[PDB]
């Protein structure tokens, strides 16, 4: 075109064509990669230095980074979808029929209004709750920014950045051996190299592991092919739904029986005995009687239906996730929150979890003399000290330069190379500064670059000394390079020849005990070469062997102070924790013993991995799932294990059938190769500030502090959710067993329910909408970590909940029946029994209603302890919603009894009867105290 010669559509169509078909586009049209840069108004060396004013001038096509993907949620719509539940439609149908009858009555209409409350107060809580939870999830996931320094940068050229999902696209400008993973993109897990001309193109949705090269950014947003691909598009819930359906069924049966009994009794009384002929003006009274009986039946149904059980689960979970966001645990899948409560095993990693990763060197074998403590600067000969300092300084990389802990006194900043900080520290431990010589040493004859080969694992630097004496230096694993030695320094600065007699028990006595102490030993190597001529840097065979060992240093990273208590607490709660390190077996055993996982003197299984592979694999090289079943239950420490073996281990534990209880496992992981490992476990923990995004995206819980104790804080909350629901359930069931068996029995005798319909709707409103908010939000105690995990096979209604329910229903029933039958004599008040139709509200049917509501209110407090606790008031002040709800209910109760009158069929009460009602209420708590004195085993 004109000012924009290369449009966004042209580059999009270029990217669409890939493979060999793309070759003609790579070599022609836009020349080469430098020509592509010239068309992008960039340069192959710098491109765009990130200058803000240059925005909207070079590309002017970077619309947006699709930060809000869909957000298709509106408050009325959430209300509408929450309104579609079965229980809510039952209540709405009940309201419709009640109001329809009331309009054709020839007060009354009040019914509908009241039950409408039990609709609205449910539909508004859940919808806005879901909306708020969604907003929180948007607020915490968007903060995940891995920078590649800005949120979105376009028109720039960047080097390889491995370990991160590629957000951009575009062919790589220049490079070799470029290797990317396209596992989940195209369904092919095979790694495919990026050829220079055949297939140089790169696309998003791909996880890069290793390789080299440099690429350019040609992506903006959804316009990328990865976005185009997507733009084309709980075991507790089951048991709760089962219980809800059964309760509703029983309620329906009871309503049918009650209405049948009432109408049958009335008709038989009116016609079989009285024998009154029907008259054309006598229909309306029969109409009124039938309407009243039907309203009674409808409200007896509506009370028994649990329209508050669905609300309790959502309230509990949405409170729990928010509190977990402040306890160093970020949750992205709601299942994990409750699943983690039943976890029965945890498989963890040594580094990053059980170690602070502040590695320092403790012991040192220098000049044939061993120092357990920190060496003095002058304790060893100064000659050997300066020689080793010069060697380590020229060996170290320039880039590594101690940046003081970024905050300092708050968080350390051991630069890049982890171990190197330890070695650099040892430099200053000898009162010798590293930076002087670091700056002093220039670019010498830099054969150095051994590229840290995978097999050798040696950081090697071969250069000339300032006196033009060429020498090769090497820093590697002590045991793999120990045999590649021919001389050793002494205490007097003498190169004593390394002999097989020296390679004897002396070296092991030097190194192995420190490994049993928990220290990883790294040695110092350097082979000298003649000053004239220079060594053949092509002849690398002799340069990597027969070096000279200066000293061996034991470097170690201490365990965090808070993990022994945490793992002890976990082992108290029945959760056994294994260990998968991937390092030397002896060191892993040493650290595990002092971490509390493994105690001495007890039979336990620790494997090196090779024998683990031998035992797991059969003769043909497959998995039999039988030989493994005798290994895992005693296995604790697995050392030098590839990430591929962790997946087989978790599969073997989670699919085993030897034990009666299915093992629920939760394995941590942060490396790039652990995808299947997290995915196949029940819940995957991913480390936040020390983990690759490949592990983070394929997980369920993300730890912010990368600490093991936070795991426990996610198993204390996970159990609590369950308990919350349980206690709520208890309360509601009690009320049902005392409401229904009163409306059925009362109407079986006195031809009218002692509680009329509006009163029953008020009782339902309490027990099914305010109980959920009062009892669902209970913050956890520390005792939840003292009981064994439950498992999937367990009834909802525990054995002690039945004891509490029956024990309190007996008391409520005996008191209400005694009141209804002989309460006209105790209080010395006019009877109200067998009242005629349209009678004024009596003062004998208000004491019953008031005692019933007060008894429920003072049993809501007693419902909070489900395990047999006696101090029912323990922690009642930790929850303000509970106290607010109870006191608000009490105050509204008083105002509607006093000022109710005709609509609520309640007459005002004198001050003598109120204190008797509250006396019975307190008697409720005392009976609750008594009932806990009966062992459940005898029954």
């Amino acid at each position: 075109g004109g000012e924009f010669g290369c449009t966004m559509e042209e580059l999009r169509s270029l990217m669409e064509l890939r493979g060999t078909e793309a070759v003609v586009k790579i070599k022609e049209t836009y020349g080469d990669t430098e020509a592509i840069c010239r068309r992008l108004k960039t340069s192959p060396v710098e491109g765009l230095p990130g200058t803000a004013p240059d925005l909207e001038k070079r590309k002017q096509i970077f619309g947006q980074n699709f930060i809000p993907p869909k957000k298709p949620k509106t408050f009325l719509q959430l209300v509408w979808e929450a309104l579609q539940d079965v229980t809510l439609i039952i209540l709405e149908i009940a309201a419709i029929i009640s109001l329809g009858l009331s309009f054709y009555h020839p007060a009354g209409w009040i019914e509908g209004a009241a039950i409408l409350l039990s609709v609205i107060c449910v539909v508004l809580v859940t919808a806005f709750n879901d909306w708020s939870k969604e907003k929180q999830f948007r607020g915490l996931q968007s903060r995940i920014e891995q920078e590649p320094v800005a949120e979105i940068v376009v028109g720039d050229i960047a080097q390889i950045k491995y370990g991160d999902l590629l957000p951009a696209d575009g062919l790589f400008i220049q490079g070799n051996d470029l290797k990317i993973d396209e596992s989940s993109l195209t369904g092919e897990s095979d790694q495919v190299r990026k050829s220079v001309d055949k297939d140089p193109m790169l696309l998003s949705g791909t996880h890069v592991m290793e390789g080299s090269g440099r690429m350019v950014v040609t992506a903006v947003g959804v316009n990328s092919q990865t976005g185009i691909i997507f733009t084309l598009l709980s075991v507790l819930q089951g048991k709760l739904t089962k219980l809800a359906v059964q309760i509703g069924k029983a309620g329906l049966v009871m309503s049918a029986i009650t209405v049948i009994i009432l109408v049958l009794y009335f008709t038989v009384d009116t016609f079989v005995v009285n024998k009154k002929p029907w008259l054309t003006e006598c229909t309306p009274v029969y109409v009124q009687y039938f309407v009243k009986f039907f309203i009674i039946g409808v409200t007896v149904l509506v009370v028994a239906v649990p329209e508050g059980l669905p609300l309790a689960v959502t309230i509990s979970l949405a409170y729990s996730v928010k509190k977990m966001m402040k306890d160093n645990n970020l949750v992205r899948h709601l299942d994990a929150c409750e699943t983690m409560g039943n976890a029965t095993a945890i498989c963890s990693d040594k580094t990053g979890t059980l170690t602070t990763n502040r590695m320092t060197v403790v012991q040192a074998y220098v000049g044939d003399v061993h120092y357990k403590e920190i060496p003095d600067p002058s304790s060893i000969n100064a000659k050997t000290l300066e020689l080793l300092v010069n060697a380590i300084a020229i060996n170290s990389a320039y880039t590594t330069k101690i940046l003081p802990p970024e905050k300092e006194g708050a968080l350390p900043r051991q630069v890049g190379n982890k171990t190197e900080c330890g070695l650099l520290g040892f430099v200053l431990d000898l009162r010798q500064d590293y930076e002087p010589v670091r700056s002093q040493m220039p670019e010498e004859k830099l054969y150095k670059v051994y590229t840290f080969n995978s097999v050798r694992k040696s950081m090697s630097t071969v250069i000339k000394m300032p006196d033009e004496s060429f020498r090769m230096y090497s820093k590697g694993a002590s045991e793999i390079v120990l045999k590649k030695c021919c001389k050793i320094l002494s205490g007097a600065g003498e190169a004593r020849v390394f002999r097989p007699r020296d390679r004897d028990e002396m070296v092991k006595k030097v190194i192995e005990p420190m490994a049993c102490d928990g220290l990883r030993t790294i040695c110092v190597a350097y082979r000298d070469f003649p000053s004239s001529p220079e060594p053949d840097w092509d002849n690398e065979n002799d340069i990597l062997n027969e070096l000279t060992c200066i000293c061996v240093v034991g470097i170690e990273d201490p365990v965090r102070p808070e993990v022994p208590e945490a793992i002890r607490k976990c082992q108290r709660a029945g959760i056994t924790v294994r260990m998968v390190t991937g390092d030397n077996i002896n060191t892993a055993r040493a650290i595990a013993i002092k971490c509390g996982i493994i105690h001495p003197g007890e039979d336990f299984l620790c494997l090196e991995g090779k024998e683990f592979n031998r035992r797991i694999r059969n003769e043909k090289g497959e998995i039999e799932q039988e030989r493994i079943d005798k290994i895992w239950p005693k296995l604790r420490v697995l050392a030098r294990s590839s990430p591929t073996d962790k997946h087989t281990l978790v599969k073997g534990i989670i699919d085993s059938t030897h034990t009666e209880q299915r093992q629920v496992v939760a394995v941590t992981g942060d490396g790039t190769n652990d995808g299947p490992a997290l995915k196949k476990a029940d819940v995957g923990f991913a480390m936040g500030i020390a983990g690759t995004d490949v592990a983070k995206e394929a997980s369920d819980i993300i730890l912010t502090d990368d600490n093991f104790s936070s795991i426990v804080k996610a198993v204390m909350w996970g159990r609590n959710v369950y308990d919350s629901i349980s206690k709520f359930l208890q309360f509601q069931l009690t009320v049902n067993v005392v409401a229904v068996i009163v409306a059925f029995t009362g109407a079986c005798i006195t031809q009218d329910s002692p509680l009329k319909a509006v009163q029953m709707l008020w009782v339902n409103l309490i027990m099914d909408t305010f109980a959920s908010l009062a009892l669902a939000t209970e913050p956890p105690t520390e005792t939840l970590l003292l009981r064994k995990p439950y498992g999937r096979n367990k009834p909802l209604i525990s054995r002690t909940m039945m004891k509490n329910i029956l024990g309190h229903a007996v008391y409520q029933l005996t008191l209400i029946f005694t009141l209804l039958f002989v309460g006209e004599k105790m209080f010395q008040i006019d009877s109200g029994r067998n009242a005629p139709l349209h009678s004024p509200p009596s003062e004998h049917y208000t004491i019953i209603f008031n005692t019933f509501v007060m008894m429920q209110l003072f049993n809501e407090i007693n419902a909070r302890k489900i395990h047999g606790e006696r101090n029912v008031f323990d922690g009642i002040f930790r929850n303000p919603i509970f106290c607010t709800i109870v006191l608000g209910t009490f105050a509204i109760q008083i105002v509607i009894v006093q000022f109710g009158g005709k609509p609520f069929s309640c007459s005002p009460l004198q001050l003598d009867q109120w204190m008797w009602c509250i006396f019975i209420g307190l008697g409720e708590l005392v009976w609750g105290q008594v009932i806990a004195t009966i062992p459940t085993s005898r029954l």
Binding site: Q828, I829, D830, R870, N871, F873, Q910, L911, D912, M915, W916, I918, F919, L922, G923, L925, V926, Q929
Partner: protein
């Protein structure tokens, strides 16, 4: 001053078998001896002196001597012979006692004519006792002798005109399809004429008393008033008597301490007590109502509330709190 009329009676158009009065009031200066002059209906020239006691005491004249001459004529047993013109004249002549003089003495003209037409006769149906029988009851009254153009007629009960009872109805009928004690009362059939006084007559309908409404029970705190009542319907209206139950039988109540107020009306019987004492006042009372036909009764129960009521439940609450806290602290 000259003789000026103050209150001049209007002409009378009365009927037979009745009695009426004429009221003449004139200021006199000097006050004359007030008498009356009588003339025939067809001739007003006659000036016969009128004096009480004539015609066998059928007409009586009373005159008050004072600042204002006031004369009242009462005529009883009206017949066709009572039609005539009566005149009251006031004289301002100081020498009025000189009766042997010319008729030129000062006089005034205040004539009033009286006419008599036939008395109305109404024949009414006999008295009816409403029993529990469902047979409709018909009340009849017949205007058997009216000399005058009838305007309209209507039934009334207890002075209240019944709805839709106004037609011509020279003979009028009222039917009760479902006679009840609430229907019984003093019925009348009033006959309104164009220029004649109304005739009412009487048919009383009797029934046993029925108690309509009452307080089923009464509760009050000690040292406070108490009111009880018992409405009733029926006719003729019954006598009332209150009573109190004691040792299983009814007994008369006595003023004694002077706290009982018993107000009686046609219906309604309010009994009021003041400064109640729990010692004897609680119990049950009864309001007997007795009529000529029968007696109806209903009972009420009154209980007084001691002012120390709230104290006991408060002790109960404290007992519960104590026995709760003791157990909770002993638990630990």
């Amino acid at each position: 001053q000259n003789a000026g009329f103050v209150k001049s009676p209007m002409s009378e158009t009365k009927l037979t078998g009745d009695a009426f009065e004429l009221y003449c009031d004139v200021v006199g200066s000097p006050t004359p001896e007030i008498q009356w002059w009588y003339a025939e209906v067809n001739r007003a020239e006659s000036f016969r002196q009128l004096w009480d006691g004539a015609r066998k005491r059928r007409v009586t004249v009373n005159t008050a001597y004072g600042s204002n001459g006031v004369s009242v004529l009462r005529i009883t047993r009206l017949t066709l012979e009572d039609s005539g013109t009566y005149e009251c004249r006031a004289s301002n002549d100081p020498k009025r006692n000189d009766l042997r003089q010319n008729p030129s003495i000062t006089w005034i003209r205040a004539q009033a004519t009286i006419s008599v037409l036939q008395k109305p006769r109404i024949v009414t149906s006999e008295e009816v006792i409403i029993r529990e029988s469902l047979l409709p009851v018909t009340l009849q009254c017949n205007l058997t002798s009216s000399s005058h153009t009838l305007m309209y007629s209507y039934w009334t009960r207890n002075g209240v005109e019944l709805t839709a009872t106004r037609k011509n109805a020279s003979n009028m009928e009222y039917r009760i399809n479902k006679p009840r004690a609430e229907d019984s009362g003093e019925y009348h059939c009033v006959y309104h004429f164009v220029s004649a006084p109304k005739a009412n007559a009487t048919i009383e309908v009797k029934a046993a008393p029925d108690i309509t409404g009452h307080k089923r029970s009464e509760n009050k705190n000690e040292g406070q008033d108490a009111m009880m009542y018992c409405k009733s319907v029926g006719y003729p209206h019954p006598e009332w008597i209150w009573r109190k139950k004691e040792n299983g039988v009814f007994e008369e109540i006595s003023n004694s301490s002077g706290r009982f107020f018993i107000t009686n009306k046609e219906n309604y019987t309010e009994l009021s007590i003041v400064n109640l004492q729990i010692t004897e006042d609680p119990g049950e009372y009864e309001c007997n109502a007795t009529n000529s036909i029968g007696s109806a009764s209903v009972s009420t129960v009154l209980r007084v509330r001691s002012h120390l009521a709230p104290l006991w439940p408060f002790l109960g609450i404290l007992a519960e709190i104590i026995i709760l806290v003791v157990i909770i602290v002993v638990y630990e």
